[PDB]
Amino acid sequence: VKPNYALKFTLAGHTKAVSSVKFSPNGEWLASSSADKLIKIWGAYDGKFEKTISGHKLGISDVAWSSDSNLLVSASDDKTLKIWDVSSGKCLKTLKGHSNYVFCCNFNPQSNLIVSGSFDESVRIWDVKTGKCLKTLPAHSDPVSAVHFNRDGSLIVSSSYDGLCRIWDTASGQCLKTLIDDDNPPVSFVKFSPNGKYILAATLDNTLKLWDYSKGKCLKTYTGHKNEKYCIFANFSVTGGKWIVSGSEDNLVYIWNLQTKEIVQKLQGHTDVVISTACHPTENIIASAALENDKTIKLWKSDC
Numbered sequence: 621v622k623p624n625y626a627l628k629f630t631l632a633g634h635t636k637a638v639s640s641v642k643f644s645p646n647g648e649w650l651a652s653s654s655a656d657k658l659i660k661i662w663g664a665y666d667g668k669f670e671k672t673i674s675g676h677k678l679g680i681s682d683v684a685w686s687s688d689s690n691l692l693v694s695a696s697d698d699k700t701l702k703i704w705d706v707s708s709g710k711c712l713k714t715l716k717g718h719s720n721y722v723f724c725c726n727f728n729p730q731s732n733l734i735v736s737g738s739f740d741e742s743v744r745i746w747d748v749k750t751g752k753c754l755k756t757l758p759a760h761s762d763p764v765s766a767v768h769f770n771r772d773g774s775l776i777v778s779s780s781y782d783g784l785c786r787i788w789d790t791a792s793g794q795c796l797k798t799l800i801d802d803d804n805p806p807v808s809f810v811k812f813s814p815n816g817k818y819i820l821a822a823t824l825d826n827t828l829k830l831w832d833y834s835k836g837k838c839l840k841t842y843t844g845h846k847n848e849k850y851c852i853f854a855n856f857s858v859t860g861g862k863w864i865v866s867g868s869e870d871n872l873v874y875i876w877n878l879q880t881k882e883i884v885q886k887l888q889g890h891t892d893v894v895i896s897t898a899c900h901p902t903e904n905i906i907a908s909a910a911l912e913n914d915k916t917i918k919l920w921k922s923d924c
């Protein structure tokens with residue numbers, strides 16, 4: 621089995637670099653954030669432009685959906701996160717506390733908490749209802765590139781340019797694990813596997829690694845792409861074959877067989893760095909997005 625992802629839609633509208641794309645958990649929508657200070661909403665299946673959500677004062681590095689698909693959270697260079705009601709476009713809360721660019725964010729599965737990571741080297745945990753910061757974790761000694769909750773929300777994983785991935789207990793704020801990788805190259809992205817047993821980490825030595833984070837063992841290594849400068853999203857694709865999906869600094873989307881580590885497809889079409897990819901929750905659809913010289917988002921579909 622290889623997949624046969626083919627380009628179906630190209631989504632144009634952002635006027636600066638796209639930073640993040642994410643499918644809604646209900647599969648209906650794609651949300652995009654950009655250096656143009658905007659969030660856009662698009663139809664997940666047809667790429668149809670839906671609406672623009674605005675209000676940040678500087679560029680946005682990340683956006684993320686609540687579990688019920690009703691809210692977004694965005695992370696901005698203006699040092700804030702904003703919580704958005706997607707249907708009305710309202711800014712429900714502005715989360716203030718970080719002392720530098722907010723880079724990454726996510727809801728927990730219950731979606732009563734938001735985790736954020738910042739250039740201020742901290743990870744912050746927030747109450748969605750009140751907008752109050754509940755915990756500030758002294759997480760890293762360099763900017764925080766990613767933060768993600770596990771499947772039951774009891775753990776947080778963070779990555780940083782300091783070369784570390786750390787595992788945090790959500791309830792206590794305690795650091796439970798530090799993962800150490802030879803020569804400590806900057807970690808540019810991390811997330812949990814859908815089942816929560818592993819983490820997938822990207823490092824700025826053109827490498828993705830799948831870790832058993834409890835045992836602290838590297839189980840798989842994926843290479844062949846280019847990633848030495850930018851924080852590029854990576855994904856588990858689970859709707860068809862079991863793949864790993866990433867952007868790349870050679871303007872391609874890469875797809876690997878998870879088990880064998882072989883490159884099974886490379887998707888051509890973008891004209892600048894592919895900074896973000898996302899995988900649709902029930903259908904074999906990949907969304908990708910590119911930097912300043914391209915500015916477009918692409919929807920690719922496969923039969924497996």
Ligand SMILES: C/N=C(/NC)NCCC[C@H](N)C(=O)O
Pocket residue numbers: 637639640681682723724725765766808809850851852853895
């Ligand atoms: C939140 N996570 C990201 N990547 C993992 N964001 C995209 C990179 C944004 C960065 N300012 C840039 O333009 O490179």
